[PDB]
Design a protein around this ligand. Structure first.
Ligand SMILES: O=C(O)[C@H]1CCN(c2ccccc2)[C@H]1COc1ccccc1
Length: 135
């Protein structure tokens, strides 16, 4: 029972980051958390079981885990410890993750590009790009 989401499954390691501190500033992350989070080189583990997608991040800073069904809102605790309401959908092969909290919104898009999993994080006008490779 293969699914298009299968392109994302596996274990991935962070290899590059751009503009992440500015993105975190826009989200409202405090100085100390930005410094320590920005140093992290997470592994991201993506798995699928039936309709349930699991994305785990493991790092020296924090471990995070979400499980979800596409299009079905859920409660998430982010790496910076926001309590958010999240909805993840697939739009043309791109995983689109919207997080809402305190009247704010940010969108995280995840796409396969060559042998990379590219993660684009947008808050207001500020974009950060984080590139992962297979571990
Ligand atoms: O997936 C990514 O790279 C982005 C996605 C957004 N996000 C983030 C957003 C606001 C504040 C901190 C991180 C990253 C998650 O990164 C980590 C880093 C360490 C441990 C777990 C996850």
């Amino acid at each position: 029972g293969s699914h298009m989401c299968d392109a994302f499954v596996g274990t991935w390691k962070l290899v590059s980051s751009e503009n992440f501190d500015d993105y975190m500033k826009e989200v409202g992350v405090g100085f100390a958390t930005r410094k320590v989070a920005g140093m992290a080189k997470p592994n991201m583990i993506i798995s699928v079981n039936g309709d349930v997608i699991t994305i785990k991040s493991e790092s020296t800073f924090k471990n995070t885990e979400i499980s979800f069904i596409l299009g079905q809102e859920f409660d998430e605790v982010t790496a910076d410890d926001r309590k958010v309401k999240s909805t993840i959908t697939l739009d043309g092969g791109v995983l689109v993750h919207v997080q809402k909290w305190d009247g704010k919104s940010t969108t995280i898009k995840r796409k396969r590009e060559d042998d990379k999993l590219v993660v684009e994080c947008v808050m207001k006008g500020v974009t950060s790009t984080r590139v992962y490779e297979r571990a």
